[PDB]
Amino acid sequence: TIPHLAIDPFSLDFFDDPYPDQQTLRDAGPVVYLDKWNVYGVARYAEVHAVLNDPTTFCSSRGVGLSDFKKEKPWRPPSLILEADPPAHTRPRAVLSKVLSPATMKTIRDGFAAAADAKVDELLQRGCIDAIADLAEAYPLSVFPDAMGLKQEGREHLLPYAGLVFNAFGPPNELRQTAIERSAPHQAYVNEQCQRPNLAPGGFGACIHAFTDTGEITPDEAPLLVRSLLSAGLDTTVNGIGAAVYCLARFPGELQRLRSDPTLARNAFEEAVRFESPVQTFFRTTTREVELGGAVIGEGEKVLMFLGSANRDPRRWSDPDLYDITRKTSGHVGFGSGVHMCVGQLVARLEGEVMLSALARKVAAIDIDGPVKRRFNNTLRGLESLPVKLTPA
């Protein structure tokens, strides 16, 4: 009854242009079977949202990559938050929610905004810049490692480590195997920085360790929760900000609306997160036989959720393929949904808001002016190089 498709959603041809195949995945039915990898797939908004909000049946403790932790060894010790279900998930989640809380955002906002303003002014002096290396990477690198409290030495391992993490959620294709092979130096750097003596007092890392006093996490849990922030907290924002700039470059009408009201910066970033969905996919594992979209899925089955597809499903979104900075974005799944919804979303939105605010106030036009190159990753969608000319306001 369930349709079987040969589409490989982790193929370079799919990454190069995923939208026709995402429509095929939605329109084949509410649930598909992907013969290439022997997993179920759900690509429509309703089912993706339902699965995310059904954690007792669609669990995370057997891994949110293709690999099932009940069957294979995890490539690194499992995340205490991402790869945990309630109740084990609950207190580690509360610790990160407090470390990255509304109140915490007050302590970093002025510096994060100042760094964005200065970066945009610097790029305007250069005029022709690469919006990936010179902006989407440079700006988060200038704020987030410091906000973590990381030392200077070794920071060149952060983005390679994150590329590995996100590649490793994928199937054992060439991207994943090349990522994991000889990755020990990246792992050793990150694991060392998670130990309490290496984290500057006052930064996110030290604050995680300070929560061991409360009973919410033990001392031996704190390094793995620092590791969570060093895994998810940088490369995501690189692709989120990159997506926003690419959107503004492609939709000059929307850049002009943002210039006219820079208070749209935060929703312009949220719409970029829906529109591009920098985190494209991840998995759940069934804990029991379950009916979904009229299909009966057995226990212990991997289910691939297409977040980017759900964020463009015309069943849910009007003009889903348009970038609209005044869209009512609430309900998009680019940050997830339910108990695992991105605990770093206020940090992500802060960075995106203040960069888009700096662009809105300082830049009059953004023109692609060189070869654009895509960056391939089993989980992340974004660009390797985005040459643009920035004209000052």
Residues tagged in the binding site annotation for heme b: 89, 93, 284, 340, 342
Question: Does residue 279 interact with ligand QZP by CB under 6 A?
Answer: yes
217 binds ligand QZP (CB under 6 A): no
Residue 273: count of CB within 10 angstroms of its CB: 27
Beta-carbon count within 10 A of 219 CB: 10
Site for ligand QZP in 225-244 (CB under 6 A): 227-228, 231-232
Q: Rank residues 29 and 308 by Cβ distance to ligand HEM and give the closer one.
A: 308
CB-nearer residue toward ligand HEM: 171 or 334: 334
Q: Which stretch binds Cl ion (CB under 5 A): 63-71, 179-187, 235-243, 309-317?
A: 179-187
Residues 31-60 that bind ligand HEM (CB under 6 A): 60
Q: How many residues does the chain have?
A: 393
Our finding on whether 233 is near ligand HEM (CB under 6 A) is yes
Give the neighbor-by-neighbor strand order of the sheet with 387-392. 128-130, 387-392, 363-368
Residue 347 as a binder of ligand HEM (CB under 6 A): the answer is yes
Nearest residue to Cl ion, scored by beta-carbon proximity: 187
Binding site, by residue number, is 89, 93, 284, 340, 342
Interface residue with ligand QZP among 48, 81, 175, 238 (CB under 6 A) is 81
**Which of 2, 36, 68, 76 forms a contact with Cl ion (CB under 5 A)?**
76
Size of the site for ligand HEM (CB under 6 A): 27
Pick 342 or 354: Cβ nearer ligand HEM: 342
Residues 311-340 that bind ligand HEM (CB under 6 A): 334-336, 340
| 25, 52, 64, 120: which one binds ligand QZP (CB under 6 A) | 64
Give Rg (Cα) of the chain: 20
Regarding 273 and contact with ligand HEM (CB under 6 A), the answer is yes
Q: Which residues bind ligand HEM (CB under 6 A)?
A: 60, 64, 81-82, 93, 96, 100, 228-229, 232-233, 236-237, 240, 273, 278-279, 282, 334-336, 340, 342-344, 347-348
